[PDB]
Amino acid sequence: NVWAKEPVLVASFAIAGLAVILPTLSPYTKYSLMINRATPYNYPVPLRDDGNMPDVPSHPQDPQGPSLEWLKRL
Amino acid sequence: VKQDMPPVGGYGPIDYKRNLPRRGLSGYSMFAVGIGALLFGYWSMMRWNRERRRLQIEDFEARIALMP
């Protein structure tokens, strides 16, 4: 068929079609979102204590808040 | 005697074939080993980039703790 006619075109459309469709299958896009969201740039601001939250840990050593542990575990 | 330049009883033949070996790999084998080394490089690349991001996050935490 066209595999002898314009073969570089066929390979181009093939890798293009997989580059379009292939993000629909991934266990890794959620990992990409977690990495690219959980990187701090600005200053992590403080806030007033007396909202009486069962969250927002007062100590940076304290793991009471949402953090990351899959990072060092790859 | 006579001393011309004759051939001595007949000489050996000399080839007239387009002697071509056409060696090297096929399409499938060369294609597959290229894509295999490509995927090897991809896996090692992925590993180094994510460990590098770990260290760069540590650098971010350094500038955070340094600032006030």
CB atoms A35 and B60 under 8 Å: no
A37 reaches B (C-beta below 8 A): no
A20 reaches B (C-beta below 8 A): no
The single-letter code of the amino acid at A3 is W
Distance of CA A59 to the CA centre of its chain: 27
Cα–Cα distance for residue pair A50/B27, rounded to 1 Å = 71
Residue B54 CB-density burial (10 A; 0-12 exposed, 13-18 middle, 19+ buried): middle
Are the CB atoms for A28 and A35 separated by under 8 Å? no
Nearest to B60 among A41, A71, A72 (CB): A41
Are the CB atoms for A57 and A65 separated by under 8 Å? yes
Nearest to B60 among A40, A72, A74 (CB): A40
Cα–Cα distance for residue pair A31/A71, rounded to 1 Å = 10
Neighbours of A32 (CB within 10 A): 10
Cα–Cα distance for residue pair B45/A11, rounded to 1 Å = 24
Distance of CA B29 to the CA centre of its chain: 12
Are the CB atoms for B53 and A35 separated by under 8 Å? yes
The CA-based dihedral angle spanning residues B54, B60, B65, B67, taken in that order and rounded to the nearest 10 degrees: 170
Measured at the CA of A31, the angle between CA A29 and CA A36, to 5 degrees, comes to 95
Q: Which of A49, A54, A51 is nearest to A66 (CA)?
A: A54
Q: Could you say which DSSP state residue A24 is in?
A: G
Cα–Cα distance for residue pair B38/B34, rounded to 1 Å = 6
Query: Tokens 């909202």 appear where?
Result: A51
Cα–Cα distance for residue pair B36/B41, rounded to 1 Å = 9
CB atoms A40 and B53 under 8 Å: no
Residue A7 CB-density burial (10 A; 0-12 exposed, 13-18 middle, 19+ buried): exposed
Are the CB atoms for A56 and A63 separated by under 8 Å? no
CB atoms A71 and B57 under 8 Å: yes
Q: Could you say which DSSP state residue A5 is in?
A: T
Are the CB atoms for A70 and A38 separated by under 8 Å? no
